[PDB]
Amino acid sequence: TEDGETVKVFEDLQGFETFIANETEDDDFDHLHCKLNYYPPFVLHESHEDPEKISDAANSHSKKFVRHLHQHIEKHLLKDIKQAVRKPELKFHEKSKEETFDKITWHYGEETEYHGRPFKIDVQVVCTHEDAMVFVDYKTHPVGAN
């Protein structure tokens, strides 16, 4: 896995989820930032399990691509994040979707607390018109610190 700036960029859910879980055990949960860039399972399954065989139509301009991506986000990705932060019943009370010609961005946000420390979880998920890759950004920070 790459460190793009001071942030780890993972290529699979296992590495990403394990990072978040370990950093939670290590009391670092309120100052985390990592990324995950991958192709969603459905698009690989549609393309002979080869990124080079993915249709050029499989991108943010395909209603089917977007719908199936959202389904994966809601069934798997968020479930993994909730498991890792030890809050399986968490709900994100901030949700948004922004669509431009070039990309669709979903945001899921929640102010929560763990070990007596309040913190904000922000999950950004981006898909684009250029190709089928999905870009996840996971970031936390304290709330109301002085």
Author numbering: 16 to 161
Share the article's original sentences:
Like the majority of uncharacterized genes from S. cerevisiae, YER067W codes for a short protein (≤20 kDa) that is present in duplicate in the yeast genome (shares 70% identity with the ORF YIL057C), and its homologs are restricted to fungi and contain no characterized functional domains. Transcriptional control of YER067W by the main stress-responsive gene activators of Saccharomyces cerevisiae explains the wide range of conditions in which expression of this gene is induced. Altogether, these results show that both the Yer067w and Yil057c proteins are involved in the control of energetic metabolism and significantly contribute to cell fitness, especially under respiratory growth conditions.
High-quality crystals of 11V-161NYer067w were obtained allowing the determination of structure to 1.7 Å resolution using the multi-wavelength anomalous dispersion (MAD) method. Analysis of crystal packing reveals that Yer067w forms a dimer in the crystal. The most prominent patch of invariant surface residues is located in a cavity at the junction of all four helices. However, the conserved cavity is long and has a largely hydrophobic character, hinting at the large size of the ligand and suggesting that this cavity is likely to be a protein-binding site.
